[PDB]
Amino acid sequence: STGSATTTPIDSLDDAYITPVQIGTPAQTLNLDFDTGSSDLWVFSSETTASEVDGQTIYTPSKSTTAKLLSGATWSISYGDGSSSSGDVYTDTVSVGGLTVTGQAVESAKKVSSSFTEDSTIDGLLGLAFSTLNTVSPTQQKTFFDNAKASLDSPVFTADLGYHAPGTYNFGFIDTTAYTGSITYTAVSTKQGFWEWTSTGYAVGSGTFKSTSIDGIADTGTTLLYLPATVVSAYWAQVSGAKSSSSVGGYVFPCSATLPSFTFGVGSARIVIPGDYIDFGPISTGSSSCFGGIQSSAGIGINIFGDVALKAAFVVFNGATTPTLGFASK
Is 40 an active-site residue? Predict the structure, then answer.
């Protein structure tokens, strides 16, 4: 089997991407944030504290003939941005782009933090990291991908995120029309439960490539590119007037600037992020200070190849017995 679903930016900045997901019988379609940096499929639901729901579409398990309470199971998750959610668990039928999993754990939120409430466009998350990070207790649950894997034509999924445009998540096949050149594969460590890999270096604009190992995670659920302070300083030094602002929370730059590209290495291959992808617009409405899309990972504890980086590539998440990651230009 295979599946193919379109993923759409939630706003004009590509702050996140939503993908429609069918849950239950009859289908209830919710727009979920596919997150390769976490491993819980959780939704706004009929159980979510009413004051914490503001515009989201909810899953109502009592209206699904295939829903079953997973008795005694609870979940609770905290994300890198300080947001969180928790609740109980049902199993139900879940379909993405025509690919169906029966008995998928669907984690129903009883509580969500303010950032989730405030984002009316995101009805939940669908985790695509390794199932070892799943938070369900006392019986850990598998991700949608892990459940689907054995049925897929090939044990892979691909992320093809758009810049200010829709893109595609495919399951079970590699669309050879969706990228240019060849796919370069690179080793993955699953020791921390992430799609963790080592970039071979970087360049700023038309500058020379610096060969240096940068360990980080491929994370579709993180908006920006978070890299070591040395790398980030080298980038922003090429933008007149750019500075790190503790009050704003990162690097800012004059909105009048033209940003240089940023290149990262995948083995001997190179992925180029155009300068425009690094512009996250005014820090506040009407400001002439703009927020940068490349930020320091110092004090996160991990480097993160988030959407800024991933949307410049066609990315293969290879879930074979020894997982790997593939990157191609597009």
Answer: no
Decide: 109 and 45 in contact? Cβ < 8 Å: yes
- Hey, what amino acid is at 164? H
Two tokens, residue 33: 């944030």
Does the CA dihedral 163-169-173-175 come out positive or negative? negative
Provide the residue type at 155 as one letter.
P
φ/ψ bin of 97: left (φ > 0), alpha (ψ from -120 to 50), beta (otherwise)? left
Closest CA to 78 of 112, 31, 32, 104: 112
Give the angle 245-163-144 at the CA atoms, nearest 5°: 100
- Pairing verdict, β 68-78 and 167-171: unpaired
Dump the DSSP string for 113-180: -HHHHH-TT--EEEE-S-GGG---BSS----HHHHHGGGSSSSEEEEE--SSS-EEEEES---TTSSS
Domains of the chain are 5-174 (2.40.70.10), 175-330 (2.40.70.10)
Give the integer Cα–Cα distance in Å for 146 and 98.
16
Catalytic residue among 199, 261, 296, 297: 199
- Residue 323 DSSP SS3: coil
The Cα-based distances of 23 to 93, 122, 123, 193 in angstroms read 6, 15, 12, 26
Q: How was this structure determined?
A: X-ray
Beta-carbon contacts of residue 161 (< 8 Å; ≥ 6 apart): 7, 14, 17, 167, 220, 307, 310, 311
Q: How far apart are CA 7 and CA 1, in angstroms?
A: 20
* Residue 81 designated active-site: no
> Cα 115 vs. chain centroid, distance in angstroms?
16
